[PDB]
């Protein structure tokens, strides 16, 4: 039959802000004291990380950025890139 207790809630939503009623607002990261006073970006990683915990990232334009290193290895090089020009002295 009747459907009582509508309990309009237009007032309650504004209590947290009005700009949030049209925009979810961007999330912000936390500040680590150990990382001096630098502010972490949520959409750029200049430092080159380690390929393990960090998920395979995604790029969307420009941004000279680092990477996730998969294999680092140091050995002894060859004397000569190619061809017959192989002088040493």
């Amino acid at each position: 039959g009747m459907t009582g207790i509508l309990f309009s809630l237009g007032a309650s939503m504004v209590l947290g802000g009005v700009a949030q009623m049209l925009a979810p607002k961007a999330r912000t990261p936390r500040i680590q004291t150990t990382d001096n006073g630098k502010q972490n970006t949520y959409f750029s990683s200049l430092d080159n990380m380690v390929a393990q915990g960090n998920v395979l990232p995604v790029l969307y334009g420009e941004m000279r950025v680092g990477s996730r290193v998969v294999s680092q290895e140091i050995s002894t090089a060859d004397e000569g890139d190619g061809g017959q020009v192989v002088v040493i002295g």
Partner: protein
């Protein structure tokens, strides 16, 4: 001088110079931890080492 082996990321070379003693034991003269391959010593005396 030597050659760099298949080390994973960082190479450091530890150099230890020992001298054979008169009785037959060993004597330690200096030590080094470097990165460059070639090394040069200087002002060495006595005999075998």
């Amino acid at each position: 001088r030597w050659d760099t082996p298949k080390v994973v990321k960082g190479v450091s070379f530890l150099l230890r110079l020992t001298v054979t003693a008169d009785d037959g034991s060993e004597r330690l003269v200096s030590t080094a931890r470097t990165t460059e391959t070639t090394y040069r010593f200087t002002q060495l005396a006595l005999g075998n080492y």
